[PDB]
Amino acid sequence: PQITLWKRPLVTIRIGGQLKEALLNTGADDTVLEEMNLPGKWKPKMIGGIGGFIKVRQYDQIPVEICGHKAIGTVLVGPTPVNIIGRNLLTQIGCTLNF
Amino acid sequence: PQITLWKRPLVTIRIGGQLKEALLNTGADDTVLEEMNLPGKWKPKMIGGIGGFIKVRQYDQIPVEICGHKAIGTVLVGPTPVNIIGRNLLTQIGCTLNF
């Protein structure tokens, strides 16, 4: 579709057949979700935000479904003010910025 | 233009007679720039994201020129690791997400 920025671009996603609302963030490199339960093993990782570094759990190749769009990439689970869909996945669904 | 997202959407802006690089961040609500001098009266404010909170100075009706277009709004100035153009100015230049 084509979403305006007059309001937080929050859409829905079905991560592993489960629904959770998240923010489309062109300002994030990766997809970070608040404490969530994904199966499989995971690698701990350090990511940085506006305030510094934080520890987040990493899951590789999880099938995400953004507005009827298939995407399979790495999801990070960790403390985050909001759920975030980063450029890592936004690219797979042909998402672009236009002004 | 049409910014693809396979790499940080960094663009050039112009504020206070200075060229600076900013990030087109649809994930931010306000616009935060690295410590700099702007004219006028400003009020304190805490803004936060992943990593924590940082105290910024808020200036209103500041004229900016995002990668080529006019846009005056609210520019917060503080200890941010990178310049960020939020959804407040992104809309003013009629910016959108299309996938």
Binding site: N25, G27, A28, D29, I47, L76 | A28, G48, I50, V82
Partner: peptide, 9 residues
């Protein structure tokens, strides 16, 4: 290093 900048008031 992985950079993610969402901001909230």
């Amino acid at each position: 290093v992985s950079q993610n900048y969402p901001i909230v008031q």
